[model samples]
Each structure stands twice: as C-alpha cells, then as structure tokens.
Target: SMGESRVILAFGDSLFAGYGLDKGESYPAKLETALRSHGINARIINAGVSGDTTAAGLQRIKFVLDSQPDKPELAIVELGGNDLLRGLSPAEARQNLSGILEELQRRKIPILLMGMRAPPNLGAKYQREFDGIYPYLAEKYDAKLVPFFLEAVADRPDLIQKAHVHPTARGVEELVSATSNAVAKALPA
Candidate 1:
C-alpha cells in the first residue's frame, strides 16, 4: 500500500502521559489509532513526563529531539499545569514555553501547541495574563494550536478521574474524539 508514514511526537505532561490509564490509553496512543482509522499512517511517540513543568520541558526537549530515531513530521507541544502548581509566575512560564517552542523552530519540526488555561483560583489578574500566553506564542511562532487542550474533558465530571485532574480511560476517549481532528488538521495535507 502506498501510504504516507507520518511520525508525530506528543510531548507534554500527565495529560499525554497516560497517567493512571493503562497501556495504549493515553491521548497519543488513542490518537494514533484515530489517525490510522482515517487511513493516515502515523506513529505518534508518547514522551509525556508526568508533573513536568514548562521549565523542565524546555530543558528536556532538546535532549529528547536529539535522540529521536526520525525527526517528527509534526510535534505537539503541551507544557502546562505544573508551574502553576509550584506557583511559578506566568511570565516565566511564557518564557519557558517560548524556549521549548524555539527549539522546535530551530530544528524545523512543524509545531502544534496545546494551550493551557490558568485555573480561576489564580484570580482574574493572574488568569488574564496567563491565559493569553499560548495565543501570543502561537502567533509568534506561526504554530498551529489547540486553544484549550483539556476543554472536552476538564469540566465533565464523568470524564475526570477520582483525583479530579487526570482523565479516566473513558475520559481519554472523550479527549481523543474531541482533539483528534485538530491533530489530523495539524498534519500536512
């Protein structure tokens, strides 16, 4: 079969990490299945490190890319949720994300960034400033973006796990269904 074999990297934290989910249950795994179902030959690497912050991702991304067997056709970047937990400033998070994005830019991997919104508990001022970073950075890098990565599963009680942050397997299904189109769209035509 004359199929295009596209390699993708789903780089992020627990959301992409599969967290409590069993093997092949993570977004990247389900995503690969989704794309193949559409006749798009794809291999999406799951390089999600749970509890990893934007700063940590920035530091690790270079090493990760350098060791890739084949340079990814597209890389989905999702560095979120942790820095806020550690009370790192949004400006710093923004810079950290920029660095990560920049590394991809330098390497010439087509980039699709998954955006993260600051929780409301951060207050209006913090949320306002923090929430805008993705759009701003996406524009700067000419990168495709999933405006809110967790939109489908975040608020759905049925989708979240007991801890209320990670998604259950069914929750991951909701996520894969909701965001697979974006992943498809991010790939070259």
Candidate 2:
C-alpha cells in the first residue's frame, strides 16, 4: 500500500485553476495532501484552464490523455460552470459533457464527476435543467459523483473572494476535506 500510488487527472475550470489564489493554493495540491493524510498515495496532474467550458474540454480531452505518461487511474471531470456563466443552454452543456464522459469511458478510465449547481439568478427552469445535468450524466455513466463541487463554500462570503465565484485558499482546504474521501474511493486498487 505504501508503494501504491494513484495518478489522477484534475480536469476542470477556474475553481481548479487557483483563480486569484497562489498556484500552490489550487484544488489538486490540497487534495493531494488530504489523500496522503488518509493513507492513499495520490498524485494529481492539474489540467485546469481558467474559464474553460465543456466544449473546450471536449476538444482537449484526447490530447490530454495522449500527453499522460501512463493512463490516469481516475479523471476528475469538472466543467459546466463556465457554461452556466455564459448562459449556454443546458442541453448544449450536457451534450459536450457527455462527449467528455464518452471519451473517458472509451479509454477505460474511471471518473469522479465533480458536480456544479446552477445559481438562482439563472431562474427556475434554467436552474432545474442545469442542476440535473451532473447527476444525470453520473447515473448514465455509473461514475462516482460529488453532488456539489462548491458544497462547502458556495454562498459563504468569507470563503469566497471579490470575484464572488471562485473560492479562497481557505475554502480550497474545505473543498479538499469535503471530497477527498470520494476521490480516494474512485481510484482503482
């Protein structure tokens, strides 16, 4: 167990990109520490791009896989936040994300879908459709799911920065603590 290490692809948007925080304050590094604390040897490659949408992710997914020295034990798929911000239709986001999941499935990689919620500002119908996307996809693919990526920090003024969207460094710790268990179990033994 001590020698066993899982390589994970931390793929997502600004939330994983460190946004306004220092690069070391990013989500992947924090999750690495948490996984090690739980005795899981986790090495995560940060593949986050600021403001990336699901469409953008689809274009790069194959290239990213090609670049990995070895196949990743798990791919943490997180997108749609930028899609939501851009007011893209839920159907479009869902389609793009489905393509991403399909690519991962074809490669035989495990997935940990980090879900995002649609804020109220988007209105009732839009919120309902957008909020349903992650669980729908996770169920379709039978992948592991973290119901809410911002479960710990969303709507909390102290945990958010002036951008009011990305979490602070402290908030990143909360996120790592909150999801590391799910992530640990997603990696194949």
Candidate 3:
C-alpha cells in the first residue's frame, strides 16, 4: 500500500451527489468503498450540488479547491446535464466547462471528466454540440474522459428516478462501477 491517502473530488450535479438516495449511496461514497477495498486509501468528497449548471460549477470551483482540507489528487467533473436540460446554448456550456477545466488545470490537479448526453428531444444538432464539449475539453486539457457517465443507467427507467434524470442507488452503483477504473488509474502508482 502507498500508506499515503489520496483525495478525489466528485464535482458535479445530483448524479454525483446521490440525489434522493441515502448518504452513502452516492457514486463518491461507493467509490470510496471500492478504492479502500482495493487498498488505495482514498477519500472521495461528494461535491455534487443538485441542479448545478456548468456556469455555477465554474464559479464555485476555486472556492471548492480553496476550502478543501486536502488538495485533491483528482477531480471527476460531471456537470453540463442541467445546461442541456434547460436548453441553453451549447457554446455557453462549452465556455463554462472550459473555464472550470482551466482552473482545475491551473491547480495542477488531474481530472476525470464525466461527459453527459443531451436529451433526445433536443435534436441531433444540439446533441452533437453538447456531446462534443467533454472530448473537446478532455483533449485540450489532457484529462481522462468518460465519454458518457450514465451509459448503462441512462434511459433505463427501472434504474432511473421518476424524474427521469437522477439514478437510483442501484443505478449509482452501476455508475461507480463504470467509472472506477478510470478514477483508479488516476491515483498515484
């Protein structure tokens, strides 16, 4: 074991926050368990805020960094879903997300960018625009990117909440499982 603990900031919206689920049901919580079980002393902070837009995340990122008891070794950015839901311009989402990524990079922290897809009702043009944000930023920032954070759970009504947005506890487990390896890889060897 490294014997030194690592910190991961799960920065995003309700999906990362475990909205409507128990305290430990969030992806960050589950990730902590998985990391420890593997002997990687990890502390994943649940920095998800319900309904957080990319702009909001961009605004608060520095503050989030400043207030952290320990500097993060990695950050999982899972925002932009709310912006898509609100029908906001994809350009705006890109700009805000870019700013957030820039700030995190400025801090010299590694990032795991959790991408989101636009709702089908938004049309292919908008979907393409929104979906492009993550890979674009990931490539630009040299960060690890999870092409679609909700890959398996998305569109699965049985796993999603009644609101058709947030996922259930089981759904979150799937999410954690999906993203854990990318996150684990970001840890110190």
lDDT of 1 by residue, 24-118 (tens): 99999999989977879898989899999998999899999988888999999998689876667999999999999899999899999998888
Task: Point out the higher-scoring one by lDDT: 1 or 3.
Answer: 3
* Model 2 agreement with the true structure over 54-171: per-residue lDDT tens digits: 9999999999999999789999999999999888999999999999999999999999999999987788999999999999999999799999989899768798887656666798
Cα RMSD (angstroms) for every candidate in the order listed = 15.3, 15.6, 15.7
> So what's the TM-score on candidate 2?
0.84
Winning candidate number (lDDT): 2
Q: Model 2, stretches more than 4 Å misplaced?
A: 164-189
Ranking by lDDT: 2, 3, 1
Q: Which candidate leads in TM-score?
A: 2
Residue pairs with clashing backbones, model 3: none
What TM-score do all the candidates reach, one by one?
A: 0.83, 0.84, 0.83
lDDT per prediction? 0.90, 0.92, 0.90
